[PDB]
Design a protein around this nucleic acid. Structure first.
Ligand SMILES: NC[C@@H]1O[C@H](O[C@H]2[C@@H](O)[C@H](O[C@@H]3[C@@H](O)[C@H](N)C[C@H](N)[C@H]3O[C@H]3O[C@H](CO)[C@@H](O)[C@H](O)[C@H]3N)O[C@@H]2CO)[C@H](N)[C@@H](O)[C@@H]1O
Ligand SMILES: [K+]
Ligand SMILES: [K+]
Ligand SMILES: [K+]
Ligand SMILES: [K+]
Ligand SMILES: [K+]
Ligand SMILES: [K+]
Ligand SMILES: [K+]
Ligand SMILES: [K+]
Ligand SMILES: [K+]
Ligand SMILES: [K+]
Ligand SMILES: [K+]
Ligand SMILES: [Mg+2]
Ligand SMILES: [Mg+2]
Ligand SMILES: [Mg+2]
Ligand SMILES: [Mg+2]
Ligand SMILES: [Mg+2]
Ligand SMILES: [Mg+2]
Ligand SMILES: [Mg+2]
Ligand SMILES: [Mg+2]
Ligand SMILES: [Mg+2]
Ligand SMILES: [Mg+2]
Ligand SMILES: [Mg+2]
Ligand SMILES: [Mg+2]
Ligand SMILES: [Mg+2]
Ligand SMILES: [Mg+2]
Ligand SMILES: [Mg+2]
Ligand SMILES: [Mg+2]
Ligand SMILES: [Mg+2]
Ligand SMILES: [Mg+2]
Ligand SMILES: [Mg+2]
Ligand SMILES: [Mg+2]
Ligand SMILES: [Mg+2]
Ligand SMILES: [Mg+2]
Ligand SMILES: [Mg+2]
Ligand SMILES: [Mg+2]
Ligand SMILES: [Mg+2]
Ligand SMILES: [Mg+2]
Ligand SMILES: [Mg+2]
Ligand SMILES: [Mg+2]
Ligand SMILES: [Mg+2]
Ligand SMILES: [Mg+2]
Ligand SMILES: [Mg+2]
Ligand SMILES: [Mg+2]
Ligand SMILES: [Mg+2]
Ligand SMILES: [Mg+2]
Ligand SMILES: [Mg+2]
Ligand SMILES: [Mg+2]
Ligand SMILES: [Mg+2]
Ligand SMILES: [Mg+2]
Ligand SMILES: [Mg+2]
Ligand SMILES: [Mg+2]
Ligand SMILES: [Mg+2]
Ligand SMILES: [Mg+2]
Ligand SMILES: [Mg+2]
Ligand SMILES: [Mg+2]
Ligand SMILES: [Mg+2]
Ligand SMILES: [Mg+2]
Ligand SMILES: [Mg+2]
Ligand SMILES: [Mg+2]
Ligand SMILES: [Mg+2]
Ligand SMILES: [Mg+2]
Ligand SMILES: [Mg+2]
Ligand SMILES: [Mg+2]
Ligand SMILES: [Mg+2]
Ligand SMILES: [Mg+2]
Ligand SMILES: [Mg+2]
Ligand SMILES: [Mg+2]
Ligand SMILES: [Mg+2]
Ligand SMILES: [Mg+2]
Ligand SMILES: [Mg+2]
Ligand SMILES: [Mg+2]
Ligand SMILES: [Mg+2]
Ligand SMILES: [Mg+2]
Ligand SMILES: [Mg+2]
Ligand SMILES: [Mg+2]
Ligand SMILES: [Mg+2]
Ligand SMILES: [Mg+2]
Ligand SMILES: [Mg+2]
Ligand SMILES: [Mg+2]
Ligand SMILES: [Mg+2]
Ligand SMILES: [Mg+2]
Ligand SMILES: [Mg+2]
Ligand SMILES: [Mg+2]
Ligand SMILES: [Mg+2]
Ligand SMILES: [Mg+2]
Ligand SMILES: [Mg+2]
Ligand SMILES: [Mg+2]
Ligand SMILES: [Mg+2]
Ligand SMILES: [Mg+2]
Ligand code: NA
Ligand code: NA
Ligand code: NA
Ligand code: NA
Ligand code: NA
Ligand code: NA
Ligand SMILES: [Zn+2]
Lengths: 78, 81, 48, 111, 258, 102, 50
RNA sequence: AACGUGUCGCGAUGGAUGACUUGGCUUCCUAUUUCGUUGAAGAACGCAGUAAAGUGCGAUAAGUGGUAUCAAUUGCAGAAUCAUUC
RNA sequence: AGUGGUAAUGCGAAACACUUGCCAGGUAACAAAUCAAUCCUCCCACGGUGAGCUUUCUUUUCACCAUAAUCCACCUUGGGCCUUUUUACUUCGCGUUGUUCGGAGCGGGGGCUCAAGAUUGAAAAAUGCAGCUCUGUACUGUCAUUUGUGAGUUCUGCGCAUUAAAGCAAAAACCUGGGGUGU
RNA sequence: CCCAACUGCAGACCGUACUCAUCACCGCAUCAGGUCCCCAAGCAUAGAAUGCUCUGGUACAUAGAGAAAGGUACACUCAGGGAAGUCGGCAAAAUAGAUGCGUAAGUUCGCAAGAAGCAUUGGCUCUGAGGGCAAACCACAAAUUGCCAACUCAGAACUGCUUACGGCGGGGAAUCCAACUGUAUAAUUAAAACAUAGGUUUGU
RNA sequence: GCAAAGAUCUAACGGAGAUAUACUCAACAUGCAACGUUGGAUACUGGAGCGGGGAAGGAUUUCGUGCCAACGGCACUCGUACACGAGUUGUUCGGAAACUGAGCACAACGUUAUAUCGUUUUGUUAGGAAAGUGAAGGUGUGUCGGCGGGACUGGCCAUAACUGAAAAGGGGCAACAGAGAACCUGGGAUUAUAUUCCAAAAAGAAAUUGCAUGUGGGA
RNA sequence: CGGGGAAACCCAGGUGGAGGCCUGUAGCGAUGCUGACGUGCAAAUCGCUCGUAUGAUUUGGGUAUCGGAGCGAAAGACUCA
């Protein structure tokens, strides 16, 4: 795993052809955008809630977005 | 002591299966079969045990090719005109 | 085995796991790509 | 009720190359993980004293193969092979021995 | 009867040299063109101990006379050899401890070691710890040199045969009492399987001439003929004399009037 | 899944309070040798480390100079001082003697 | 244990395959003489030792 | 009394005997009758719709081809033809 | 067609690049005891959840309170070294539990580096465990969500390293340099 | 053509069940024998001694009834005497930990030695001693002021014994032999035998 | 005789294994004994374990269902018995590919009436010509830097061919505890396998090979 | 680190942790009961007791040496009861 440092790099990461999905994780005091690339998972940590909303709407709709949630055993069975 | 107790001290194997004859007579450490002397080119054969010779002699197996060639010899190597 | 699966059933095997059974025969677990449905392939094969 | 562990690879002998450490997993299980062997590190020649060289890290095989050259040498001459005092000795030895040879040769030529 | 232990050892088997952990044979460098005409200067790089040998060994680094490389010979270090010492080997080498010179170039009365019995044999005499040879005289007419060997015998050798100046290092080793069977056990660990020793009278007569009897005794004289076959040649072999020596130890070995 | 059976440390902890107050450790209760229970080497290690720690602190705080420290350092190694208080009392006496000479 | 040559494993496999009872319909053949497998093996009675 | 003994009749246990003999032993004879690097003998693993051993066979695997024969094989099952050859 | 620092030695986005033509070292590669001791174990305080006991006592007893590799950034301890001050040892100083050390450079100041950690994040709660709520689902909302100058522990400090007339395998593979190529 | 950061595709072969033993191996057997390695909790205690215990495992090893004689036991006791028994103190009894004091002949000066002997030990309530941490060029009683962990030892008063778990040397005076540690007749001999260091001789 | 390893008791359920009866007669005095599972109770093993994993050895004894003829020296409804059906999943774990060690002995040579004998690591086969590998160069192709007027010549690097520096000491085996070795947890993923199974939110996060493309920096 | 001494040297306290050193587990062995058993659990076992337990120590795998021969700290021991 690699941590993205700035927003400019994050948009560059999302612009890669091998970035298949972006996992949006909502922590109680931060928001984490985890881009799943070919080799590495790239995480951008945004402390500001309003700034995270700006970034979330900014993400180019070509790449699939996944709202990270807890999945129960029943949903993941079989 | 010798006997029952010492029977439990016997570990490992002196002999394993032989590639040539499959008799479990292949000495692992000396890398040679006690039954057929593999990997020496020729086999063991001793007249003091004719019984051993006749266990291993020709005709104790399939005679896969010998049957065919014997028929051909008996028929004088017949071939179509 | 991957090549044979493509030739005989026109499906792409993404992973083949093999084991030699205690009876002496080789068994293969062949996972097909998500594009192919294993159940549909099994129906066509006839094992169902 | 303390936990007890087992060898998880297929080698069950406590040799120097099979040392283990006890690791508590996120699943709250106690398991044994293998300690990687360590290298003694880059040293001066044995006949010169066999001391570790400053500025050179102790890397083993794959780590040494993939690490950058600076991790195993210095910019000085004979970096990664000889120490600074050894390098200075050879430099001084080179100059002074040749100078003495020149003086002797000139003296014979003068005679 | 059965084979005697002394005969069994001749088969080799479990009585051979424990050569593992030994550094290799110790020798002078090859008697090449440079040695026969000039000299070769080396540097002592390390003084090392080999299992089964009392004398210290010296690793001496030479340049290759014909190729761009180093040689790294291994010799028996004389007493006083030190790391960094320059070793001179050749016809023109100076007379100093550690140098290797032809015997004809060495002054009479000098003390030498690592002496070549034959020219080019790379050292066969005076090699054990603390031992040395003494140069008696030179005879230029026949080109021979007379030496006093450590045993006391005098031996003549060609003057082209080389020798090393000094005495073998590690002398005085046999002066310390062992005091323990265990110390002997460790002493022979690096040499061979020859210890402990069972007396012949303690064995049975089937395996030794001295065996048996209702008393522990040799019932026949223990001095046996030189021509006795193996298995019968045990005891004091071809002894010219027996009993406590009094009034002077004569030089042992075969008699060579030359 | 039933819970594990109870193994209680209550009696041990009550006994620990008693032994902390000094009970149940007299002559009659001792089975191992005195060195086995409390090695003399460990006692000496603790004492010497304490004395050297005190000497380093005094030297750093300039209470004693290098010459006094060196003399005390050797004598501490020589088993001169039984404890920290004994060393401090000797140091006080040395300071008093130097003051009179001053 | 875990280790064995594949050749040893194959021989053990064949011995497993041979360790079977005689099929019932064999006993109904015209000139049948076989009732039960005379070469049945149990791992605790006789050792193959491969 | 009871155990036990003896005899006869009838049963059990036990597989001798007779009859039976596709086996052995022994003696004769006949001959375009003597293996293999063109991979033998021997060893191993497999092959049947059903198949452990044995037999036969070798991924063409209880067999392909050809000739002759002339209505099967057979425990069950299967099977175009009921047949100048196909 | 590398570069900075008085120096110990530093700097990596792909000319600081190629080197099995050749040469030389290093890793692999081995070692007591004492004393410190890692991961973990045990035991204490600390606080939550549930459970046991409660004629009478017990702010109690028991269980649990977990964070894998791989990475990013970069205070403690021990060793080696550099620079500076050397009028540092005249009837000396530093340091270990311990058999030491120093003008062949001790101690003090300021630095370089190595080895173990500590810490900062990414991974990583989305996991795990227990409890609990509600609605017939192996359903579903939710809450819990660390301190020890304690005792063990050979990972490590640790070797030109043990009794020794005992001195403690080798090689593949890999690393660095010397030369040369680039020129 | 050489590199850097990526990326794309592909990563073959064999082993993998179970056992490792008071039932899975060897000993004719599911045989009280034998068989290498790793992980190893709590209390007492010097503790991997020994006793008991949470976790895990188990009640599987023909059972029931049940004071005959005689037996076996990894079971005890016995008045008075105390080796009178016996080839022989065989067997059993006895000694017992820790701490202080004290300890003979002889001796290769190392030992002999735990020589021999004497004394103390519980419980409870106290007292003393043994530390860490933090704080304002001269000399400066931070020579005191707070807070705190983990233990050990010593000394008192009071109050007990039926001398009471386990575990744990009997000692002394001499003779013979071997210097010692070791080795050694698997299955009747462990010794004074063998070995040993030391000494001497022989061949070279 | 089936007595070492202490010890079992109780209820319910399961089972043909019962509470099984001429007359008399209320039940005791006329169906005894012994079982598998679950829950209780009592105790044992006491971490140097009747605990959890491996090597050697064994080779299906593993798992589920059925089943009680024979076998488990008593018993069984139970079983490591019997019958039937199933189970062992790897780029990273172990081995091999691919290291050397004590050693082994193919070639070579020698010996022997006869090889089925000897030598074969003290750096090392064999009277012994055992190297087929290739540095600098000359000759063509392609990738480049530089000059002059896409090409043309001094210069770089790869691609094939003529030579020809340099390299002495043939070919192999022998360690599943030495050397070497790129993967970790989580799981509702099994009746039995898992650092081996999980598929788009791979529960997932990595590491490491071999070839390629494109991007960028150099030639 | 102290105490004596003209000197040579001697005396005392601590530190340190040596030994084919001692007590004693595991381990490796096997003394006595001439115990049990002696158609045994066992063609050599069981119990208590006992030797040793940092060394000439114990042990796994691999490898080397045999049949008038191998091996033997030596008992004619051992070389698959
Ligand atoms: N009766 C006394 C005994 O008879 C015995 O012998 C008797 C039997 O051996 C013999 O055989 C009889 C036969 O007689 C009579 N007629 C028919 C009967 N089947 C036979 O009996 C036989 O067959 C039956 C079954 O069928 C078996 O149970 C029985 O064991 C068997 N002996 O009859 C004999 C009686 O005369 C013995 N010889 C002897 O020990 C003694 O005398
Ligand atoms: K062959
Ligand atoms: K015969
Ligand atoms: K299968
Ligand atoms: K171990
Ligand atoms: K067999
Ligand atoms: K009693
Ligand atoms: K004396
Ligand atoms: K003996
Ligand atoms: K299983
Ligand atoms: K039965
Ligand atoms: K012996
Ligand atoms: Mg025998
Ligand atoms: Mg054995
Ligand atoms: Mg063998
Ligand atoms: Mg072998
Ligand atoms: Mg596989
Ligand atoms: Mg190392
Ligand atoms: Mg190191
Ligand atoms: Mg560097
Ligand atoms: Mg030899
Ligand atoms: Mg002797
Ligand atoms: Mg004798
Ligand atoms: Mg004789
Ligand atoms: Mg005699
Ligand atoms: Mg005598
Ligand atoms: Mg005599
Ligand atoms: Mg002490
Ligand atoms: Mg196994
Ligand atoms: Mg068996
Ligand atoms: Mg096997
Ligand atoms: Mg069949
Ligand atoms: Mg074909
Ligand atoms: Mg026809
Ligand atoms: Mg080293
Ligand atoms: Mg090694
Ligand atoms: Mg000074
Ligand atoms: Mg250490
Ligand atoms: Mg498996
Ligand atoms: Mg398994
Ligand atoms: Mg086990
Ligand atoms: Mg058993
Ligand atoms: Mg048998
Ligand atoms: Mg205690
Ligand atoms: Mg115990
Ligand atoms: Mg205990
Ligand atoms: Mg049993
Ligand atoms: Mg029984
Ligand atoms: Mg009495
Ligand atoms: Mg009396
Ligand atoms: Mg008497
Ligand atoms: Mg009497
Ligand atoms: Mg009497
Ligand atoms: Mg008498
Ligand atoms: Mg007695
Ligand atoms: Mg006296
Ligand atoms: Mg003795
Ligand atoms: Mg005597
Ligand atoms: Mg001893
Ligand atoms: Mg003894
Ligand atoms: Mg005996
Ligand atoms: Mg005996
Ligand atoms: Mg005896
Ligand atoms: Mg009876
Ligand atoms: Mg009975
Ligand atoms: Mg019993
Ligand atoms: Mg009995
Ligand atoms: Mg009734
Ligand atoms: Mg009933
Ligand atoms: Mg218990
Ligand atoms: Mg166990
Ligand atoms: Mg089962
Ligand atoms: Mg029965
Ligand atoms: Mg079965
Ligand atoms: Mg070798
Ligand atoms: Mg040789
Ligand atoms: Mg040769
Ligand atoms: Mg190999
Ligand atoms: Mg290994
Ligand atoms: Mg691997
Ligand atoms: Mg897991
Ligand atoms: Mg779970
Ligand atoms: Mg399993
Ligand atoms: Mg001892
Ligand atoms: Mg002892
Ligand atoms: Mg043993
Ligand atoms: Mg008896
Ligand atoms: Mg009896
Ligand atoms: Mg009896
Ligand atoms: Mg005799
Ligand atoms: Na006489
Ligand atoms: Na300085
Ligand atoms: Na089956
Ligand atoms: Na996967
Ligand atoms: Na054992
Ligand atoms: Na021989
Ligand atoms: Zn064979």
């Amino acid at each position: 795993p690699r941590e993205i440092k700035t927003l400019k790099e994050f948009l560059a990461i999302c612009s890669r052809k091998d970035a298949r999905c972006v996992k949006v994780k909502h922590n109680p005091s931060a928001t984490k955008f985890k881009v799943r690339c070919s080799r590495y998972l790239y995480t951008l940590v945004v402390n500001d809630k309003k700034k995270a909303d700006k970034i979330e709407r900014s993400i180019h709709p070509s790449v699939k977005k996944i709202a990270v949630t807890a999945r129960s055993h029943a949903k993941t069975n079989a | 002591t010798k006997g029952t107790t010492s029977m439990g001290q016997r570990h490992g194997r002196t002999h394993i299966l032989c590639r040539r004859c499959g008799r479990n007579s292949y000495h692992v450490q000396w890398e040679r079969c006690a039954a057929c002397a593999y990997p020496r080119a020729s086999r063991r054969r001793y007249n003091w045990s004719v019984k051993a010779i006749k266990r291993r002699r020709t005709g104790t197996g399939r005679c896969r090719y010998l049957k065919v060639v014997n028929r051909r010899i008996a028929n004088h190597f017949k071939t179509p005109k | 085995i991957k090549k044979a699966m493509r030739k005989l059933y026109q499906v792409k095997a993404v992973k083949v796991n093999t084991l030699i059974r205690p009876d002496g025969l080789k068994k293969a677990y062949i996972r097909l790509s998500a594009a192919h449905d294993a159940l549909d392939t099994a129906n066509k094969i006839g094992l169902v | 009720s303390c936990p007890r562990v087992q060898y998880r690879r297929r080698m069950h002998y406590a040799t120097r190359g099979n040392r283990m450490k006890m690791v508590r997993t996120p699943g709250n299980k106690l398991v044994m993980q293998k300690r990687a062997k360590r290298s003694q590190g880059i040293h001066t020649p044995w006949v010169l004293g066999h001391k570790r060289l400053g500025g050179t890290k102790a890397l083993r095989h794959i780590d040494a193969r993939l690490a950058s050259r600076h991790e195993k040498s210095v910019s000085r001459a004979y970096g990664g092979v000889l120490s600074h005092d050894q390098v200075r000795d050879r430099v001084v030895r080179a100059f002074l021995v040749e100078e003495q040879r020149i003086v002797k040769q000139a003296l014979k030529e003068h005679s | 009867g059965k084979t005697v232990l002394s005969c069994r050892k001749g088969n080799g088997s479990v009585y051979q040299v424990h050569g593992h952990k030994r550094l290799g044979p110790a020798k002078l460098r090859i008697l090449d063109y440079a040695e026969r005409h000039g000299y070769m200067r080396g540097v002592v790089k390390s003084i090392e101990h080999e299992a089964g040998r009392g004398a210290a060994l010296a690793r001496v680094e030479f340049r290759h006379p014909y190729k761009f490389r180093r040689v790294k010979e291994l010799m028996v270090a004389p007493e006083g050899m030190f790391t960094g010492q320059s070793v001179f080997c050749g016809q023109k080498a100076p007379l100093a401890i550690g140098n290797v010179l032809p015997l004809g170039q060495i002054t009479e009365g000098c003390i030498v070691c690592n002496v070549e019995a034959k020219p080019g044999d790379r050292g066969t005499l005076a090699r054990a710890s603390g031992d040395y040879c003494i140069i008696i005289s030179h005879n230029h007419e026949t080109g021979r040199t007379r030496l006093k060997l450590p045993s006391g015998q005098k031996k003549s050798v060609p003057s082209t045969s080389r020798a090393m100046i000094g005495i073998i290092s590690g002398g005085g080793r046999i002066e310390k009492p062992v005091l323990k069977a265990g110390n002997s056990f460790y002493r022979f660990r690096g040499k061979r399987n020859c210890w402990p020793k069972v007396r012949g009278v303690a064995r049975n007569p089937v395996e030794h001439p001295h065996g048996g009897g209702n008393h522990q005794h040799i019932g026949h004289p223990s001095t046996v003929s030189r021509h006795s076959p193996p298995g019968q040649k045990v005891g004091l072999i071809a002894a010219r004399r027996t009993g406590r020596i009094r009034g002077g130890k004569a030089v042992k070995g075969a008699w060579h009037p030359e | 899944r039933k819970p594990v059976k109870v193994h209680s440390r209550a009696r041990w902890r009550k006994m620990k309070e008693a032994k902390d107050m000094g009970r149940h450790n007299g002559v009659g209760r001792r089975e191992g040798s005195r060195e086995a229970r409390m090695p003399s080497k460990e006692l000496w290690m603790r004492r010497l480390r304490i004395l050297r720690r005190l000497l380093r602190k005094y030297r750093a705080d300039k209470k004693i100079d290098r010459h006094v420290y060196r003399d005390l350092y050797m004598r501490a190694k020589g088993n001169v001082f039984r404890n920290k208080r004994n060393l401090v009392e000797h140091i006080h006496k040395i300071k008093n003697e130097k003051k009179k000479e001053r | 244990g875990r280790f064995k040559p594949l050749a040893v494993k194959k021989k053990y496999a064949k011995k497993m395959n041979q360790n079977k009872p005689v099929p019932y319909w064999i006993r109904l053949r015209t000139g049948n003489r076989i009732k039960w497998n005379e070469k049945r093996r149990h791992w605790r009675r006789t050792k193959l030792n491969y």
